[model samples]
Target chain A: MINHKIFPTADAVVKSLADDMLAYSQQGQPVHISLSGGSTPKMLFKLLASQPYANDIQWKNLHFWWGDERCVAPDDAESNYGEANALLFSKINMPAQNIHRILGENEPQAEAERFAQAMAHVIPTENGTPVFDWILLGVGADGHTASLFPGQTDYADANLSVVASHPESGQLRVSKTAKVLQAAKRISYLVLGAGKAEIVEQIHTTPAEQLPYPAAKIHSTSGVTEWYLDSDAAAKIA
Target chain B: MINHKIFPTADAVVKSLADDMLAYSQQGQPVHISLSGGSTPKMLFKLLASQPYANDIQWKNLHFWWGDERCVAPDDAESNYGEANALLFSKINMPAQNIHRILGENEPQAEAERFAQAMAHVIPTENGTPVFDWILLGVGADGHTASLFPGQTDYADANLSVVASHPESGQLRVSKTAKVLQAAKRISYLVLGAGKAEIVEQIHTTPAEQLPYPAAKIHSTSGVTEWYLDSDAAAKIA
Candidate 1:
């Protein structure tokens, strides 16, 4: 089972999580990771850039990836790349070549497919599957993660990437499918806030058969999975 | 395109999701659904038992199956059916003949195959695959959806379910393979909370090749996949 840890805030979780992440990168291996978009991690990126942690690791060894991106210009305020650039990438000395971002400015499906091809080319594959070293995820209160919503097919197939169209809004999106996640070396879920406590508890305590909440489904390849939750976020569990 | 809705809390998500689920059951000629375990939906079960909606749903017409289960006694706390019974089954007057839970209390692997066989017996198969009207899911923040995890092969295969062991905890778990999920008439993901927002974004926006969060791989046969999200859960996305 992947280890689980509960923290006090999003900051605490990111500090420790990033420490471990930096340690892995310092091991002299190419550390490939998929990053999630959100406000909490933006704080994390800033923290990573300014602190002792920045001086401790090899930024060049890290191959950065966007877990998902909005179908807008890369510099758009809504773009994940935009946020990361302002918060972390610009401050770090990492080479621009190492950061692979989804070209959200292009056609959603085409961009998704192109990113898939890029991933297939860069990451090492096992049985034709590319496995990342670690993937960082943040949870949505709605229980939706990585843009795979209830009525969408983003979570359905095993492809490098697939085009996702939001059910109600018909918003064009692109997301990674489970095929790629099941192949990852490590996975971490960053969850914070009291609002999530009850569902987190339920996911852990409930049987997988009766209540298929979306987050309960993840598992790690190297058996390296961790839930970094803050105290308030974990309070509701029995 | 799959339709999605955002709710405010786990209770609301469950009630709203279950409500939509009841409607789907009513519309489909025969609803073959696989259940998942968790506390949030237990609330939904109780809510479902409360009157109006409960009385309207055709319980006898609904066929049930377990998406995944723990290895434990049927009456154990870890038993999903046990929880369901205490919460909903005992309150509702549904046909006992239609309920099909994985005999998890039995030997894990054997029980998995038996459950698969049971599904075959209840639902007509296309070729050899069981056709389910809907498959309910809960996501674990580690990126696992269903019993399919980061490193597991069960996600991609053709079998309806597989006898798999959790690499870290060594807990033997059985789950329906992606092939089966893909073959289902419909699939739905019920999510809630801000904790799930980032991964929701990941599932929705990431390229499958780079990130590979497990939920990214789920698909439906009839192109009916949906995500029910509460506002807090979907809050991170602008």
Candidate 2:
């Protein structure tokens, strides 16, 4: 079952997440986390980077990975790395080996194979796919997450962490398959703001076919897959 | 001077930004970019992480920094660092010294100073503040960019980055000083989606105070400050 943690505002939601990651990472082994992109997360990055408690978290031991990437140059203003560089990576004291970003600057056709190769080489795997200690996601008002949007589940055939063409923008992107995300030890689907109300309703009330998009289809591999919502976004989830 | 480029969608804006970064970075010198957070960037991350061209950009030579972060953990769903890791940082190759994120996890009152110390130790600086080759920003519907909201410029006195308690949410945040951001050699303010039309209009037509937020007061140091707007975000701009 999906766990729902609703907070009064977006800040409260992130505050809880900041504490959770630190607490979870306390074990001897470095825990690997696969992160998701977008706006709502600035809150989390700031919290983690700002704490006096940051001294307590072993920055060196936290391994990080991406769930997806856009087919653009890293220097591009829109590059996922660009934002991360701006808000997260630049703030913390992490070693180079800890970060393994996708190389999306190559030919559109070549990224999938290159990423697949990289994943096999770096991350631990289950059933031949990269497995993460934690995987983060966001739901589109239309219910898209990562680079996977609505339109077709045929994307299920996509290779693990494969390139996806956005149906609406016709833009090329890299996204992890539902199968791969399901492999995460734990997953959090963050939804916030007001316009998401109607879709949030459909996700909770509908059956599989009537489901709006893949955001609802994601279930746990071996751990919990929960929905973290701000009250505004969850208002319609009756 | 500020350059304004409007595109049909957010994708085009990101695509151009990617090309610009590649062309700009060809001087063979590592350049630093200070990035902002939020959802508008996911499309950009996907583009940067996609293939065929990822190799042309020198990910290793680029330095990354953030203009702000929330007071949350790195793993929080709302953490900008988490999103960056998922979409940007985890996708590419870089040295440990390249990423410099804010430290938002300590005593709320102490973060601005901690972040300042970290910045001093890394990024190249001029005018006694960290200077960036490029600084990226996002325009809120209300006209705030980074953590600078309307009704305040006192943040201009902040050392490197400052802690701004959100006026509306009352949430504490880590935000760079206006002087530091203006020190960027080049700045790109990304405003996307339909709801932003009104704010975009206000920015172009109004004077500084009448401007809803700080998105407009931002000016560049040596290079130009540009606005990359999607049609939805710019349709109302006269």
Candidate 3:
């Protein structure tokens, strides 16, 4: 079973992620955290840059990467790194050397291969992929985290990394496979709103096979994960 | 009018606060922030202590204080400072001098006076009360934020601070007055759950005098305040 906490508000969950990253840094090198995309994470990225705690993070020591990115220009609205750069990276006084963003404008497979090589060079891999200090994920309304979706092979792939199009959205995308994300020191799911209530309830009760949500399968996977839930999304749940 | 955004989860709100604090610090020196206490804020405190973004905070330039504290020993569970210390400060590696926690175990009225003086000494005062860069608040299901309950004249006090007992709960409490909390450059309310939906809607609709919740009045008052709500808490609202 996955470890989770029902946060009354999204701010509480943001604080939780911040604290986790701090703790990781205390142990050694900068806590390398991979961020997810979309609107839910926008608030978190925005918040991380504006607060005075901005000083607490050893920006020099910390390394940031993307959990996923849309295959678009870096300046494109849909680009994950673009959103993070405008909202979070540009706002904080971090070293340019530390950020490992995917070149979204590059070819999908080539970009994925380059990113995988970069990750392997920085962090030691147990099997094929490096185990991240932290992986911050946003659960889609469909129960997907990162670009990995429900009933998808990406979640089951044992490979270190992946870059593929969504079967449903048909958007050119890049993301880490479940094999790598699950190996993280911590994996957090930021899921909110009433729109997600049905799936939230289903994830809590449904078995892995019939489970229609990718975020839920991350729970059933080998590693422990944290589910940060708001009341509306978590209402039907305990 | 109050400014606010509905977050899918509590993590986003916490991130927003951290980012805000960081931005304030980037602009200048020590940004002052007052925290509220309860089982709700406990999670945020814990998260702030553990996450890598914890490093992102400018703790040296950031002065910490409690918006309210339960009259108890610092180590006591109900002690607001105690909860904050165990979950937040204890985990972060910061100078002890930067923290300005209210001594809840002391004589109530005397402590409130001392806290007010502490505030005046560090930050600029307006109308004889110190104004903070930010004040993080929590809204109870009954619609109280920072121990300022509805139908209570205490919320209207022009004084800098107060030592009072909850009208209904009868618990000893220490808090900054509405004059002070509202004077903050930024104020945020983190409200969640279906249990809070009814009040959330009411606060949005109800007027100040006839308002059943003190939180609603903060919105109706002059300065802008942010509401970080989960889907369930915001469900009833448009």
For each candidate in turn, give its C-alpha RMSD to the true structure in angstroms.
21.8, 20.9, 10.5
lDDT of 2 by residue, B184-234 (tens): 888888888888888777776667665557887777756567777776776
Could you report the DockQ of all the candidates, in the order they appear?
Answer: 0.01, 0.01, 0.03
Model 3 C-alpha lDDT per residue in residues B9-127, reported as the tens digit of each score: 66765666566766775665777888888655776776667666578766777788888888888998788887788888887877798888888889989998998898888888776
User: What shift in Å separates residue B60 of candidate 3 from its native position after superposition?
Assistant: 27
Q: By DockQ thresholds, what CAPRI class is model 1?
A: incorrect
lDDT of 3 by residue, A1-238 (tens): 2445566676766766676655565555766788888656787776677665476666776788988889999999888888889988888888998999988899999888898889989876666668787787887767777778766646557655677677776898888887778778678777877887888777766665786777766642344466777767777853
Q: What's the lDDT of the predicted structure labeled candidate 1?
A: 0.74
Model 2 clash tally?
72
Q: How close is candidate 3 to the true structure, as a TM-score?
A: 0.51
Please report the candidate that would top TM-score against the real structure.
3
Q: Which candidate wins on DockQ?
A: 3
TM-score of the second chain of model 3 compared to its true counterpart = 0.91
